[PDB]
Amino acid sequence: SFNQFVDYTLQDIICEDSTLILEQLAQHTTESDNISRKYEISFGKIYVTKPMVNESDGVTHALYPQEARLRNLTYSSGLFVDVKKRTYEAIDVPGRELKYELIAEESEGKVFIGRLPIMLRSKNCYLSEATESDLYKLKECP
């Protein structure tokens, strides 16, 4: 269930509400400023890191479950979504239908959105690929 959730359901949740559009009306008293703006932020592919921890000073290192139990940390991994930004402009002629065009401000760009706690021995976990001697090295019971 956890591998299904990480591999497929996270991307589905991202894609269900990926597009976020805010239409800024012209609000023009005079016809000099008859331009309307439409700003679109869209989420793309979601990426999951290996489990990790950031300390107080900002140094981030790979976290293994033995260390997370001893230091009372959370065995989690970061989520990074691709965000593309769209800016659209249209000449606000009353009666005429608005036709938006890109101003070529299509800046895009992984952005950190949170830390998903990782189930142990799942595909994202370090212990899934570990052999018995590797588990003994990490002070994990096989």
Partner: peptide, 9 residues
């Protein structure tokens, strides 16, 4: 007086 910004579904 017109709303400056609005949500677009």
């Amino acid at each position: 007086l017109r709303r400056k910004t609005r949500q677009l579904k």
